[PDB]
């Protein structure tokens, strides 16, 4: 209640961020234990390979929320432990992490109710924008680097799934992370219950060796390339396809095999800045030890440039989706 507000003061916020975080925590106090009966469906906000996400209204509070339905057949003991482990999200209050309201189990689906983002995922944004301008990919990078270091310091947790569809954006110009690995039982359950069409997985995680947040940095670099150019990069673009996006399919195993055997993808030269190119090249180093880490990324030239560049992110977003 006010134990949440004490941990706000342990973070380095500015004037406009503390305003919004304090406003969200007060709305967290309007809602109690959530149930399937408490919600009125508004619209549908996604159809991931995993579970459908609805925009919904919580009747007692009036609040609008995003409801992720995760269908899983698990014994009741695992159900209760998944909901217990998800409660750490009440304490995950940061400008770069989407908010949490509550989680519960109904029917055969775990419901996760979280902060609504009217901008959607950058996956959804990408398919409307074609490609994302580099200036904005600088601001996105900052948000991701800050969200990962927040998780590692204040929670000792990795994201484990950094992808364009797990980065969400707000009309207020906020860029936040979502769908990270809080519950170890939920991690085990979703490996057995779904299949994937693409992969942002680090080559060391594919091979079973020891991994750290460096794997998330590799995933960020792969997401940045995919958002810079307008295509997933594991199968590098053809000499033709390059000359069809700027001017002057593989099965899941073949993708995973490529990420382990062939050199990582690169940003196409000439169309992007040299620093941004060097930035993704430092993120996509295969050996995790010689890959850039989180502090090195925050002092890289591309980040100090982008942090200083005042960009109207909120404006560009409302122009390209409406």
């Amino acid at each position: 209640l006010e134990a949440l507000q004490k941990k706000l003061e342990e973070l380095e916020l500015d004037e406009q961020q503390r305003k919004r975080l304090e406003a969200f925590l007060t709305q967290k106090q309007k809602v109690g234990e959530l149930k399937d009966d408490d919600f009125e469906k508004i619209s549908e906000l996604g159809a991931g390979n995993g579970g459908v996400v609805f925009k919904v209204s919580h009747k007692p509070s009036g609040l609008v929320m995003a409801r992720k339905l995760i269908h899983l057949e698990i014994k009741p003991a695992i159900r209760n432990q998944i909901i217990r482990e998800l409660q750490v999200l009440h304490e995950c209050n940061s400008p770069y992490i989407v908010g949490f309201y509550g989680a519960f189990y109904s029917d055969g689906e775990i419901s996760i109710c979280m902060e609504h983002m009217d901008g959607g995922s950058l996956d959804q944004v990408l398919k409307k924008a074609g490609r994302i301008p580099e200036q904005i990919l600088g601001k996105v990078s900052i948000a991701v680097i800050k969200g990962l270091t927040y998780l590692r310091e204040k929670h000792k947790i990795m994201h484990r799934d950094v992808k364009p569809s797990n980065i969400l954006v707000n009309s207020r110009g906020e860029i936040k992370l979502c769908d990270f690995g809080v519950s170890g039982q939920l991690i085990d359950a979703m490996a057995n219950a779904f299949v994937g069409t693409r992969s942002y997985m680090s080559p060391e995680r594919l091979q079973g060796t020891h991994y750290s947040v460096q794997s998330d940095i590799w995933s960020m670099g792969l997401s940045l390339v995919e958002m810079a150019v307008g295509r997933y990069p594991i199968p590098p673009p053809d000499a033709k396809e390059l000359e069809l996006m700027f001017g002057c399919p593989m099965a899941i195993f073949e993708l995973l095999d490529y990420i382990v055997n062939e050199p990582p993808p690169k940003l196409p030269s000439g169309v992007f800045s040299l620093e941004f190119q060097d930035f993704v090249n430092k993120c996509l180093i295969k050996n995790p030890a010689e890959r850039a880490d989180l502090k090195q990324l925050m002092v890289h030239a591309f980040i100090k440039r982008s942090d200083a560049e005042e960009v109207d992110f909120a404006g560009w977003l409302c122009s390209t989706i409406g």
Partner: protein, 266 residues
């Protein structure tokens, strides 16, 4: 059409049982309890209409006590298939949710009946292509019924449910058609593993993409050290034989059946 199309006014949909990505399964009423699988397709293309009537034609050829009883279809309002209702739960729920205490003689019977149903399908030139313990239902607890075969014509518009039961040749997808009687045997082998261990394979790996890579390369395989101690040593051999990485080294179901039948003669 043909005489297996059911008018929608005749069917009363009751409760919601399961909901995957390719459709939703409701319990219903149509001359007694029935199961209705409604496909998530609101604008079915003339192509998908033909693939549906084709998969229905394949369902029309199965009449066997270990195969789920096809009963009819609906093609106007929506695309759906009507089958018998199994009173028990799926084999997955028995083994991994309820954790029901089967005895050793019951596990072999489930193994034998599953092989009996699969033998029938292959004798009719039907490849399941997506066998898991989710698709094996225990009607009233005693007799297994195999379902979720067919409609591989409409699902391709490689399975997208789970990878735990996929044969390595199917995981790699290097052929245009890696599906065979032995890819089904591998899947049956993984179900045998479930039956004889009580848990799913690769329980220590929690990364689907790791599982896909490790199993496609041959670096990972079901851990047979977790087989029950009361599991007969001939049954242990059968698990290993079905799970073999080489597609041509795996037994066919006439042999699998005989292996179990002679084992069953205690």
């Amino acid at each position: 059409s043909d005489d297996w199309e059911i008018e929608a006014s005749e069917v009363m949909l009751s409760t919601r049982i399961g909901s995957g990505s390719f459709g939703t399964v409701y319990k219903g009423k149509w001359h007694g309890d029935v199961a209705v699988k409604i496909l998530k397709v609101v604008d079915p293309t003339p192509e998908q209409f033909q693939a549906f009537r084709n998969e229905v034609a394949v369902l029309r050829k199965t009449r066997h006590v270990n195969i789920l009883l096809f009963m009819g279809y609906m093609t106007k309002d929506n695309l759906a298939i009507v089958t018998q209702w199994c009173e028990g739960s799926s084999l997955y729920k028995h083994l991994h949710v309820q954790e029901t205490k089967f005895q050793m003689f019951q596990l072999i019977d489930i193994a034998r009946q599953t092989a009996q149903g699969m033998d029938y399908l292959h004798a009719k030139n039907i490849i399941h292509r997506d066998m898991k313990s989710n698709n094996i239902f225990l009607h009233e607890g005693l007799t297994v019924k195999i379902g979720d075969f067919g409609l591989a014509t409409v699902k391709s518009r490689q399975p997208t449910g789970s990878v735990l039961w996929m044969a390595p040749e199917v995981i790699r997808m290097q052929d245009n058609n890696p599906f065979s009687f032995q890819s089904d045997v591998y899947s049956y082998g993984i179900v045998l593993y479930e039956l004889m261990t009580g848990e799913l394979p690769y329980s220590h790996i929690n990364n689907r993409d790791q599982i896909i890579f490790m199993v496609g390369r041959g670096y990972a395989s079901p851990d047979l050290s977790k087989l029950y101690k009361n599991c007969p040593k001939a049954m242990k051999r059968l698990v290993a034989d079905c799970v073999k990485k080489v597609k041509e080294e795996r037994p066919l179901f006439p042999q699998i059946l005989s292996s179990i039948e002679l084992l069953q003669h205690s």
